[PDB]
Structure formats: structure tokens, C-alpha cells
Design a protein around this nucleic acid. Structure first.
Ligand SMILES: Nc1ncnc2c1ncn2[C@@H]1O[C@H](COP(=O)([O-])OC(=O)C[NH3+])[C@@H](O)[C@H]1O
Ligand SMILES: Nc1ncnc2c1ncn2[C@@H]1O[C@H](COP(=O)([O-])OC(=O)C[NH3+])[C@@H](O)[C@H]1O
Ligand code: NI
Ligand code: NI
Lengths: 519, 506
RNA sequence: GCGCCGCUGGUGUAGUGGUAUCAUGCAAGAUUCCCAUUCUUGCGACCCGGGUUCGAUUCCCGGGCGGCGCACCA
RNA sequence: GCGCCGCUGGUGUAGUGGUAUCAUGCAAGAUUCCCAUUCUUGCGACCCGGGUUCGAUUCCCGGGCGGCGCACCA
């Protein structure tokens, strides 16, 4: 704070220096941007405990165990293109599934599925075509042609949003002409980046989950907002940024009423995003919501930024883009894209009975790749004893493998019990990994922990020797383990994977494991 | 034997799917799935994951759609679907050939026409990666290549042991000349593909016994040349007779049948056709075909691709793609060395699922019209795949019903049961029609007995039969949920619950 | 792609060189109280561009889309 | 994109104008019987194309990819 104070002051001076420069585009918010960048960097350099991940170790684990890899690596690879392996894909679908329960099923959102191929007039209308050609000229989008030859120039969608806007009329009709409603699409988006860098952070193809919440401007207040009002989270307002200030933990309700956040609709989604991101493993102490300043924005915009080894990175944008995309496409195509509400008292010799409503749009955009990479960092740990033993503390709900089945030895008496358990878990819908390899139980614990297997069932000698056949259940993080009846462990593991019990509750109900005594 | 027009009218009106970019004129071969269609699709995909990936512990991966040119050159897709064409130019780089064609003054070998300079004719979607344009690429025409190119790490993930299977679910692109017939011929469609890697020595599947008893229609190549029609056979009994080459092909054929059945394709309008030697390399191929108003269409293609995929890519990149297994004992010019393991180049069995066609088949196989009203159309979607498991319906717009609607909906949501609430203006029969139309599996109706009787009970209605029972509102979510998971059927419900003889109040 | 015929509210449908009929659907208010009830009101359309014309939804051309056929079908 | 430095089994790391070290990982056999145990054996690598050369993983041009810094960031 002693080293940061002068840089804070500096940002502040050039801050409302700018406000003065317009109080009565020569002006350089570029100068302001530089100063804040300095402050940002040095605050970052001052903070580490070191509190932060050994990126090279974590990337090694991800690589070795095929969480994700360079696409076409066998052909030399293509910059900015990545494939997800078994664990990567599994973790992804879990993150997407949780996203579906958290947003779509919760708010009864209308999820649609649109083509990635997009004709040129659509993107010229939204201004994507005009805004992303550059200095021979090269476009930051992927251009292609549809059909015969070059009869129809098209692009790969840069975003998922436009498919919703263009289907507004049938979406609205499906909600029977009533506002408000929301549509969503989960799919891939394409950015022909001139320089893909930092692994999954900036890629040329990535999976995006987008939501367009359509709402009557006359009615921009969310009914469920007090479900998130008392949440305390870090906010970084435009005022705070230009004041040279840092982020500040506030109450959501306060920030909305004080007017820091425009409305309770935008606020609701900020709160819901917070709840979601933390649910999938992102750390609250390493998560902030940063408002967009004047030189980056639309009524209001807030990015969700997570602190990583690469610094602060946006993982979820949440914009208020009242009227535009609906209006822009409307004029472009001459097709009216609006809602209507019946006037109470009918009304320029025409008598009106309804008034047309141009809906406002609230748009949360989720970059699942970055969200996933953030989870990787925020859940990566190294065992205190063995530096080779690394593991991921994935929340049970998103852990790719909920369980592992482990005979204590390659010994044969265990094998029928192992077969029993796998099929049982398979019929309980419980994702599991069976390891009956030549390695010791410690080696195979290490393998399983490495990919974030939530719990480990170990078949021992007392599984076969004593009257009630009982295996041990092991917690990935604490490495502590209990003992329970093979009959019921698939139910117990299923429960932990769904979040209907916690490991503390399990340790409470079932006896602790002091050790083998049959041998 | 369906009214395809009427069905498609329903699909269009309730936004199952639609022409992509319709308000911009539209683009042929491109379709956007609306809420109900998307929902149905997701259930189809999840059922697929449960039926295959989870059941066989398959390694599912997720690759990019952008594919560099050399990859598709190797697999042969370029030299067959990407070329300039006089009709055709290769017979004898870019428009460098146009000069060559004029320099040697090549008229057509037939008819001797003067013809045109070669113009590019891409059946694939070409594009350029990077800012330079030094890296031409295509949208993948299939999801298999991502699996083949990551074979080493997949094998390593299975600790080097064969056999193992990998799968992928994503979009694939084909720049069709003439997109037609709705979803049956599109330019972009979601595909589910499995690559089952097996030791050529042991081209078997231990779990074939689980499907051997299935009676299904088979249409072998030797029966196609004869002219005779397809025969209903025991799946096990196609295998000892050598009609089906091996237990691996047999197992997947069985599993494909059980899946297509489970999602609602009618067993009588489903057959498996063996590819003839005329249409092939590859060891053997059996397509799953379904009977539609467009005829017999291929919706799942089960192929046997001995080696090529792994071998071609290996030879192309000079990167060996093999499994090794140990020998019983070390064995021994060109011979002087000691061997301890032998290399195995995996044989690949490939079930290929076209989700769009599968879904369209379900549409035609579950579309029905009520016996009284010709406006009342509905889909008999199986509960486990139906886009909306349940609907909440107040008998009227009276305020007495509203609080029960609100409570039951929230209950359903917390149980995860996907539901739709129709408390709008219309009558009860209207909202029944409205919800049957999109194939809502079951309908909960809140009536006057619900508000005026000692324990609060509502009715649960079956979409198909239109019959209904009565159970209390606390019970219904668990009931509907168990119907959706396939735990119970309607028979079970009518056995445990009182049939609805009419309301005694109001 | 090549050939023919087409494109009118969300869905159908009538009509025409002077900007459009009527059903259905949805909305509102009544009615009704278990299977698109009935009444009244309201909302919503000539695929797009160009040509000819004082004026085009209508006539000519082109593009887009559609239906059928031939062609191709990783 | 520009700039600078890099690319050796799945991972990490020596080394060289005559095709390569040692760990780690996996496999097999023993060992051990609750936290990468131990011994033996086996498997697997010079990013790719062209050139120079009797011969290149090594030297030289080009390409791809990676790590950074600056840009840009729907
Ligand atoms: N090149 C890239 N690579 C990976 N992820 C990206 C990306 N560009 C954006 N994202 C992620 O996708 C989200 C949306 O990106 P965006 O803000 O550029 O687009 C939109 O918001 C669409 N209106 C971001 O919040 C970010 O997490
Ligand atoms: N143009 C198209 N439109 C919709 N679905 C298609 C399609 N082309 C192929 N499919 C679906 O994809 C599946 C596989 O197609 P294919 O046989 O051309 O490719 C293969 O051989 C898989 N390697 C088919 O069974 C079909 O269901
Ligand atoms: Ni029409
Ligand atoms: Ni290496």
C-alpha cells in the first residue's frame, strides 16, 4: 500500500484530467490506460504469498494425462486450436450440465441450436464485417463460401448471440408474445486471431454459452433479485478504476440501490453468475466483477474476471445492450422484430389498441474454455510429501470421475468384488474409474488424484475375510477414509456426487479407518 | 404412410426447427432448432451417452471443427471432394491449370467441346487460418479424424491396452450441391461417432450375448443381388451363419437397434442393410436404415475399416500409431535381432450416428392425429426423450388455482423435471392440444377438487391414451420423474393410483 | 448445379397496375368448469433487389428460398 | 503480425556431422499389503520440407509449433 499509493494517485490525476478535457478526439485516454496498467501490474506483483499456482507443473499434469492437447499435434499442430481428452471433455460436460441447471432450467430459458455458418449480410448488419477487416487486407473472422462456388460468401460465427436475435419472432411467439423471456445457445464460436496465445486463454475456436434476456423497458426490474441481494462479492466500478482505486467487496443489494449497478435485472444475472462460477470451482477470493469504462462500451456492462497466473482475465461478460441488435436486424431486413402490449385506454386519425415494445437485452456470455482453465488453476494442489503427486480439487458436482475402484493388490480375491462394484456404480449413473493395474495402491491413488477423482473405494482383505463385506471410501483432498458396506457405497458415492451429503457427514455416520487387521 | 405436409406444418408452427436466417431469405441446408427441438435433441444425445459412452466406458473427446488441409488430404477427402472442375480438370495448384488447359488446348475427350477454364468446385467448406492465408483449412466433414489423430494419448489413457473405444459428438459440414428433403440432406448436422479399436487377432466383443437374442430385419448383400426382401432374423443367428462377419459388428448392430428403438423409431420401419461389394475398401459395412415418407434412409452407418485411418496418418506424419503386446517368449541379413513385443495396428469398427436424421425419423414415426379433431396433432415421444416431461394446467384462469400451479412448478424444477406451465387464456382442451402438439409426455391438471378436498390432489394425464389418474401434489413430481427416467410406466401408475372418474365439485 | 412450376399475417387462403379477402393462430375481456366451447374486440402479410410505369403485391429480368426429377451423397 | 529465444521417448533431461544419455512414465514377472515400495526385463525420442555433405538430429534457407514483450481483443 506504501508502494501502490503513488501509482494510485497518478491514475487519479490523469483520471479526471480526462473529465476536465471534455468539461469544455484529441484527448488521450490511452495515457490514462497506461497508468492504470502500471498500477494493475504492480499490485499483482505485490500480492503473492506466493498465493499462486505453479503453472508449469499444472500444465505438465494436464498434458501428461490428456486433459487437453494441441489439435493436430501429430501434424505439427495449429496455433490456437485445442482438443479435450477424456477427462477434459467429461469435466466440460459437467460444467455445461451445471450451467443448464443453474440458468436454463432455473429460469425456464428457451435454449436453441443454430448453425455456425453465417451468411455475409447478417454480419455486415451487426457490423462485425466492417469492424474486423484490417491493413492486402485480412479479416479476423473465418470467411468461407456456401454451395456451388462463390455465390454466397459467409463466415463462421464469432459469437452465439446472433442466432437468437434472428429467431426472435418465433421465440417470442413460443412464449406467446409475453415479456419477459430469455433464450440461450451453447456452441462454438470462431475468432481468426492473428496471435493465439496463453493456451486456452485466447484461442481461434472456443465453446460459448450465451443468454439473451429480453425485457420491457417499462419493466426492467427482476422479481427474483432478492435471492441474490445479500450476496457479498468484489466489485470494480468505473468510478473506482478512474479513481485509481482497487476492487472492493460490496453487498449486491447496496450496489444496485446506490446505483453502482444500473438495474436489478443486470444485477440478478451478476449474482447468478457469481453463484455459478463458485459452484464449479472458481475461488471467490480470486473473482471480481469489473464494470466497463467509457472507452470500452449499451447502457451498462460488467465483466467477470478471475485472477490467474496470467493476471486478471474475463471469463463472463454481462452487458446491457438495450435496443440495437433487434433494431439493427429489423431495419436491415425490413422485418419488424418487436413485442406488443394492449393499451388500457385506446387512443393522427388512427385509434390505437396496442403499443409496440422494443425489448431491452441483457446478455451474459460465458467463455467455457477460460472458465475451465480458471478451475484448473484454482483447484490445482501439490501433495506436501511428494512433489510428483499432484491433484485437482474439483467440486464433486463437476469432478469428471466421482469415484475410483481400487483393489489393494493385483491379487485375485479382490477381482470379483471389483467387477461387482463397477457395474453397480454404472447402474447408479456414477462416473467411475477402475484401476486393477500392476502398481501399488499408492501409485494408483496418485494416478486417480491426478485427474481429480472425487472419491476412492479400496477393496481390502477385510472385504473378503470378515462377515459383512466392507470396503473403504477415501476423500481425495484430505486422504482420510472410512469403512462401509459394499452393498451401500454406490448409494453413498452417488449422494456425495450430487451434493446430498458432505464428507463430514459421511465421516460422522460411518466408522473411521484405523487400519488393516486381517491382513 | 404419414401426412408429411401436416407434420411439417406442426414442426414449423411450434418452432421445432426452422430455416436458418429466414428473415434474411434463408440458406438452404441450414436449420436452426427451436426450444422444443433443441430439448428433444439434447435428450437424444443424453440417451446416446447413457446407452453407449457410459455403458461401454467409452473415451469421449472434443476436437475443433477447423481442420488443416494436409489432414484431409491424407484421409482422401480433398482429392475426392475438393477440386477445380472443367468436368473434370484432373483428367489428363489453382488456375495455373487454366493456362495449361489452354496451352495444350484440351477440348473434352467426349463430344470435343471447347469447355471452360477450370473453376473451383468445393463440396467442403474451405477457409484460411491465420492472417496470411498460408494455412488453408476445411470444416470437418466428419468427427472421426479428431479421434484418429489423438490415438496415442487415448491408448496411453487406457494404459496401452486393446481393445478400447473412443467417441465424439459435434457438428460436421458438407457443402452439398443441392440440399433437399429438410433435415435428411443438410450442409451442417450434429454427428455422434464411435471408433472401436481392436486387436485384429481378437476382433471379438465379450458382451455380444446381451443382444444375440434380438429379432431384427437384416438385408444382406447376397440377398440384395437376389432381389428378395429383408428378413427378420435372430441377431445371434445372423452371426453363426456368417451373415454378420463378427461379434463386434453384431454387438453394435444390436446396441444401435436398442437405442433407435428407445428414442422412438418403430421396429417395423427399421432395417439393417449390408453394403454391397460395388459400394465397398473396408472389410464390411451395415447401415441402419429407417422407413420414411422419403423412403428408406440411412440414419446410422456401422463400418469396418481394418487399417487405413491409423496407418495412413502414421505414414503421412511419419508418426507410428500402434499398440504393442508382449510375446509368450522372446523370438529372433534382415534377421539378427531379439523381439520381446509385437506391434499391433488396431482394426477399427465405426458406428456413425446422424442425429438430425434420427430425430426426423422419430418425428415421422411418432406423429399422430386425434380421432375426432383433424387440428389436434401430437407426437408420441417416448418419455425418456420427450422435450417436456410434464405440463402444469389450471382447469381455468380462476385465482383459486394459481397458487397450486406456482407451487407444483417450483417443485418440478427442484426435482429437475423439465416442465411447461400453460396458465394462459384458452380452455382446457385447447391447452391439452397445445401441449400434445409438442409431445409433452404427461399433463398435470389442477381442478376444483384440488382446492375443495381434504388432501390436495391433482390429476396426472397420459398424452397418448388421454387417460388420467389422481394423486396428491406432493407425490406428482416424484411420479412424473420416475416416468421420465423409465423407472415406471403408465401401467404402474394406474395400478397404484385411482382412475379419474370426474370432479365432484364445481 | 441443370430443368420445370411456385413464394400473400405465425399457419393457411381470396384477390388485383391504384398498397389486400377470409379462416386459423395468438392477445384482451366475457362465457364455460376435463379434452382446440361460444361471443365481441384487437394484433399480424403481398420473399428481396432492379427494370417498365404517374403508381407494382400484380408485368419483365435477377438473386434467395421451396416442391418434383436427373446428377453427387465423406 | 512484428521482435527475441527455443523444439531430443507420453513427461523431463544429457549429448553429438557417423542416427542418441539418464531419470520418470507405462508394460511383463516377482516383491510389498493402505498413500508414486523394491529388483530384473521390456517399450518408446532428435518438430517437418529443401539444401550442403560420402553421410545431418547436429551445418544452412523455409515452414509449423512453443515461451516471452508490444500490439489487437466482437
Ligand atoms: N479468443 C478467445 N479465446 C477464448 N475465449 C474467448 C476469446 N474471446 C472471448 N472469449 C470468452 O468468451 C466470452 C465472450 O467473448 P466476447 O466478450 O468477445 O464476446 C461476447 O461477449 C458476445 N457479445 C468472454 O467472456 C471470454 O471468456
Ligand atoms: N447431408 C447430410 N445431412 C444430414 N445427415 C447426414 C448427411 N450426410 C450424412 N449424414 C448422417 O451422417 C452419417 C454418416 O454419413 P457418411 O456415411 O457420409 O459418413 C461416414 O461414412 C462416417 N465416417 C449418416 O448415417 C447420416 O445419418
Ligand atoms: Ni406463407
Ligand atoms: Ni520432450
Amino acid at each position: 500500500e506504501e508502494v501502490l499509493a503513488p501509482l494510485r494517485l497518478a491514475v487519479r490525476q490523469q483520471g479526471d484530467l480526462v473529465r476536465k478535457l471534455k468539461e469544455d478526439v484529441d484527448k488521450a485516454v490511452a495515457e490514462l490506460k497506461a497508468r492504470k496498467r502500471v498500477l494493475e501490474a504492480k499490485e499483482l506483483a505485490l500480492q503473492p504469498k506466493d498465493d499462486i499456482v505453479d503453472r508449469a507443473k499444472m500444465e505438465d499434469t494436464l498434458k501428461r494425462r490428456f486433459f487437453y492437447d494441441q489439435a493436430f499435434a501429430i501434424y505439427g499442430g495449429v496455433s490456437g486450436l485445442y482438443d479435450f481428452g477424456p477427462v477434459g471433455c467429461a469435466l466440460k460436460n459437467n460444467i455445461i450440465q451445471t450451467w443448464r441447471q443453474h440458468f436454463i432450467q432455473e429460469e425456464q430459458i428457451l435454449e436453441i441450436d443454430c448453425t455456425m455458418l453465417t451468411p455475409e449480410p447478417v454480419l455486415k448488419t451487426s457490423g462485425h464485417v466492417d469492424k474486423f477487416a484490417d491493413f492486402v487486407s485480412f479479416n479476423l473472422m473465418f470467411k468461407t463460401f456456401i454451395g456451388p462456388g462463390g455465390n454466397m460468401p459467409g463466415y463462421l460465427r464469432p459469437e452465439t448471440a446472433q442466432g437468437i436475435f434472428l429467431n426472435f419472432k418465433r421465440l417470442l411467439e413460443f412464449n406467446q408474445g409475453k415479456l419477459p423471456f430469455a433464450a440461450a445457445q451453447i456452441g462454438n464460436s470462431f475468432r481468426n486471431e492473428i496471435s493465439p496465445r496463453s493456451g486456452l486463454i485466447r484461442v481461434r475456436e472456443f465453446t460459448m454459452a450465451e443468454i439473451e434476456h429480453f425485457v420491457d423497458p417499462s419493466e426492467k426490474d427482476h422479481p427474483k433479485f432478492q435471492n441474490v441481494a445479500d450476496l457479498h462479492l468484489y466489485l470494480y466500478s468505473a468510478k473506482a478504476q478512474v479513481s485509481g482505486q482497487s476492487a472492493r467487496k460490496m453487498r449486491l443489494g447496496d450496489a444496485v440501490e446506490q446505483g453502482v449497478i444500473n438495474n436489478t435485472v443486470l444485477g440478478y444475472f451478476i449474482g447468478r453468475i457469481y453463484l455459478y462460477l463458485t459452484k464449479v470451482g472458481i475461488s471467490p477470493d480470486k473473482l471480481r466483477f469489473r464494470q466497463h469504462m467509457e472507452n470500452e462500451m449499451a447502457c451498462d456492462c460488467w465483466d467477470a474476471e478471475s485472477k490467474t497466473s496470467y493476471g486478471w482475465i474475463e471469463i463472463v461478460g454481462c452487458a446491457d445492450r438495450s435496443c440495437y441488435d433487434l433494431s439493427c436486424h429489423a431495419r436491415a431486413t425490413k422485418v419488424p422484430l418487436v413485442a406488443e402490449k394492449p393499451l388500457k385506454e385506446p387512443k393522427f386519425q388512427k385509434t390505437l389498441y396496442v403499443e409496440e415494445v422494443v425489448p431491452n437485452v441483457i446478455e451474459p456470455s460465458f467463455g467455457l474454455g477460460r472458465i475451465m482453465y480458471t478451475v484448473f488453476e484454482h483447484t490445482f494442489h501439490v501433495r506436501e510429501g511428494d512433489e510428483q503427486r499432484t491433484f485437482f480439487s474439483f467440486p464433486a458436482v463437476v469432478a469428471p470421475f466421482k469415484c475410483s475402484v481400487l483393489p489393494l493388490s493385483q491379487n485375485q480375491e479382490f477381482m470379483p468384488f471389483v467387477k461387482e462394484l463397477s457395474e453397480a456404480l454404472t447402474r447408479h449413473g456414477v462416473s467411475h474409474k477402475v484401476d486393477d493395474s500392476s502398481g501399488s495402491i499408492g501409485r494408483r491413488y496418485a494416478r486417480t488424484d491426478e485427474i481429480g477423482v472425487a472419491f476412492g473405494v479400496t477393496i481390502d482383505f477385510d472385504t473378503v475375510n470378515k462377515t459383512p463385506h466392507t470396503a473403504t471410501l477415501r476423500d481425495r483432498d484430505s486422504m482420510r477414509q472410512i469403512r462401509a458396506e459394499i452393498s451401500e457405497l454406490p448409494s453413498i458415492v452417488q449422494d456425495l456426487a450430487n451434493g446430498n451429503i458432505t464428507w463430514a457427514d459421511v465421516e460422522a455416520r460411518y466408522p473411521l479407518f484405523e487400519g488393516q487387521e486381517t491382513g
